[PDB]
Design a protein around this nucleic acid. Structure first.
Lengths: 78, 97, 91, 104, 93, 108, 83, 98
DNA sequence: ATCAGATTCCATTCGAATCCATTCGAAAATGATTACATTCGAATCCATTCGAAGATTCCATTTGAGCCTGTTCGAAAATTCCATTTGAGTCCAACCAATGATTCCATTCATTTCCATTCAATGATTCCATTCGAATCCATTTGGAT
DNA sequence: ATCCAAATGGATTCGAATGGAATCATTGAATGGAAATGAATGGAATCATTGGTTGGACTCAAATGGAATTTTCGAACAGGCTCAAATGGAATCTTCGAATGGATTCGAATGTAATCATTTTCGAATGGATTCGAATGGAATCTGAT
């Protein structure tokens, strides 16, 4: 599913970040870093869900996870 | 046949996306990616829709700031183009690696 | 059941600006902001009391907290309205 | 009869006093502290909402949307410091293009 | 004029791993900072945990989820071990 | 009456379970503290202490010295990958750095 | 006392040079030595303010090493050994 | 007569300092710089010796790590020499600036 | 630079629709009011503790000279990667049904909190013993020039 | 491929400051018998989440064509390395002076603990709305070429 993150979507993400020109090796390197990030969040998030003795990951779990990581997210309730 | 050169309508799509808040990554592919990454941690898990949305906001935001720092690295090397080497310098200085 | 800052974000919104109303997702952002800053201030306050071995949080600790958390001019306006609000409370 | 009106605030001093007790910050909470805090919260809320509304109809929209909040936060230098490590959902970024990359 | 330290316990554990070796007072100091830092991280994360789930008490379950959150990888796994060991051994007599 | 011994012995720990419980009580972490928490925690602290002290003792006997000084402790942390993450944002007094020279700066 | 003036010049070119060595720098540009002093100054200010703020809240006139420790821990530089 | 070419006592002392823990900034100058920065923030202050020492350890650590990140910026731009441009890129990615 | 032709904003109305703001009967808190429990503003008195200075030794700091080599400028070659068409598909998106899973009670037992009352674990002091921080000196490099 | 000169370790040596034990206090675990909570334990409704299915629409993957940016490559300007002399002022020692901490008390003024009886904020629909998303007409800028 990591290939569901397309070449266009990575390009747009580079646009909003103000990048002129993309190496060909970037999209995979991009896809790498996202994965690490997306793992590290979910693990922590998933840990929160398991402590709660729940099987459904609440958006508050993701909020606590991100706050632990040091990427603080506003608008989802914390 | 009068049509555009290298790079400038790149700049043009840059200012227009920079002007919007729209989620750039296609949503459900991302959701599938969240679910597969998650099951490898624990199985039989479900996600609040808001939770997937939150993870997408965080994921694209992270990617945006990293592309900023990358581009600063590329320009710093006198080149104009982002290379894996730039992403890696960005993330090593950031203390992520 | 259960809580939000929305009614207060709204009151303050149109006391400063009679212009506008507030949308639900923007109201969310304002809520996450209030909550975040609350947590920062009170944590720094509790650390302060602890470092000095005092068992109670006073306006003095909230003040030193704000000087630590808030940058520069934002901090001084915050210390200001803090001491104002407290003094008018004693009346 | 409120403590919030007796302090002249819209923010709820009483609630802040409860949260200070139920947040495990210290065994006791002075009577002046929730007032000073609710105050600093009201001010910070207020300064934000001001910059946000102006950002709101400088695009001539009768409502403050998270985009407006992000413009407000990221343009004011001191707020940008306070919130540097926060991400605002639906925020976007500021339009910025490094010069070296502009035409001619 | 007398203060707490972890020095004796750091010291004992020192004589378990390396019975031949010493520890300098400044090196012992760094170790005290280490114990106290990690104590604070563990207990803070546990406190957040209990609060997010609306419970009034930090239990070994909280300390453990804390440890899984704070500690990286294999370090975390070995810590959960020595912990749950010590707790079961405690609950019996 | 009956003769006590410590809770540190009943879990078989060198670390002071009682003290850890006291600090958990006096630190405003929660209104009450389960009896298992100071035990698990004193375990994690004693374990981490122990792992550090081994890796440092090794750096000390690789440098031909019978006593652990902060330099060794810095060596121990910065070579072991996971300790290096755990302490990423920590600075060790009198720690030194790790010897490292980028490839490109070496004679050609 | 005496008047304190221009002590950022007590951070010499040699000392900045050693600091670049232990950090693994082969060659140092000439414009660095002042820029170093630029950033050092900033750093040492932001800590000391926080340090002094702790010292003031304690209602003390003497800055303790623990005030520097709390200060740095606030900054996100945690320092061991002076506790 | 002698002696060694450009680059040789560079690498020699990099090895020299990386092997030690000594504080590289001279002690008493650094002490003044602290008393000056502190006094012109607040006056009639006193300093525990330990508190200055703590400040100096923290400052030297901070600076050395920043020189690392800097040298990687030079090497990324293909040079061998740290430039102010490097220091400012280092501190910008570090979140200390824009 | 204008000429002088495609796109592409870029605004000024247009018609729907997805929401904000307002009104509305209850949980859920907030405020009072005695009446405790206690925290730490007020206050001497003892002692670390820093602060300042004065002196001499020599350790590095400073300053300037020559020159080797990396930084930059430029020009050329190589290629990676921009733009667009076409065509194929996988993303939206709409309810739409059913059922796991959260979630609110409401008992009882088990656990955790008190509060004195002794019993060890512990935490400064002297009181000695021992790593090791400074010295010399040989031997092994290790560079840079014939 | 080789000779010179420091330089590089690192072996051995002798003062000494820095350990690491022993001895008394005493602060603080630990004990133990009641006093509150808390955590399931089953026990039940309402949710949100998954789940398919089945239309249209962008949205996406390749393939080509060449316009520019990256690497290369080579000169040349030059900034920073490397060296040695000149002495400054850092490091070190030891001493006192008294401002300011920091243990010990002893007390009003403050915050807490209930416990009711009002007040409030949440909820959740219902009646104006503000904006999304089209539609062009014209700058607006981009462009191959006079």
């Amino acid at each position: 599913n990591i290939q569901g993150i397309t070449k266009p979507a990575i390009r747009r993400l580079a646009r909003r970040g103000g990048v002129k020109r993309i190496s060909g090796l970037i999209y995979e390197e991009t896809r790498g870093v996202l994965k690490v990030f997306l793992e590290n969040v979910i693990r922590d998030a998933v840990t929160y869900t398991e402590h709660a003795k729940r099987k459904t990951v609440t958006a508050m779990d993701v909020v606590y996870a991100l706050k632990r990581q040091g990427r603080t997210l506003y608008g989802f309730g914390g | 046949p009068h049509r555009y050169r290298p790079g400038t309508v790149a700049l043009r799509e840059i200012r227009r996306y920079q002007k919007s808040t729209e989620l750039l990554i296609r949503k459900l592919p991302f959701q599938r990616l969240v679910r597969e990454i998650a099951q490898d941690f624990k199985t039989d898990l479900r996600f609040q829709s808001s939770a997937v949305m939150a993870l997408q906001e965080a994921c694209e935001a992270y990617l945006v700031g990293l592309f900023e720092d990358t581009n600063l690295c590329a320009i710093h090397a006198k080149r104009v183009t982002i290379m894996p080497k730039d992403i890696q310098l960005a993330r090593r200085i950031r203390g992520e690696r | 059941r259960k809580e939000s800052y929305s009614i207060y974000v709204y009151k303050v919104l149109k006391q400063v600006h009679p212009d506008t109303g507030i949308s639900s997702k923007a109201m969310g952002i304002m809520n996450s902001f209030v909550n975040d800053i609350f947590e920062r201030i009170a944590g720094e306050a509790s650390r302060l009391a602890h470092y000095n071995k005092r068992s109670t949080i006073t306006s003095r600790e909230i003040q030193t907290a704000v000087r630590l958390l808030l940058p520069g001019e934002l901090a001084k306006h915050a210390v200001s309205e803090g001491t104002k609000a407290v003094t008018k409370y004693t009346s | 009869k409120t403590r919030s009106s007796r302090a002249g605030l819209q923010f709820p001093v009483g609630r802040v006093h409860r949260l200070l007790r139920k947040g495990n910050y210290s065994e006791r909470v002075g009577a002046g502290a929730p007032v000073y805090l609710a105050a600093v919260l009201e001010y910070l809320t207020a300064e934000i909402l001001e910059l946000a509304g102006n950002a709101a109809r400088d695009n001539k929209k009768t409502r403050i949307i998270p985009r407006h909040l992000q413009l407000a936060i990221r343009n004011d230098e001191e707020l940008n410091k306070l919130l540097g490590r926060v991400t605002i959902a639906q925020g976007g970024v500021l339009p910025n293009i490094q010069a070296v990359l502009l035409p001619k």
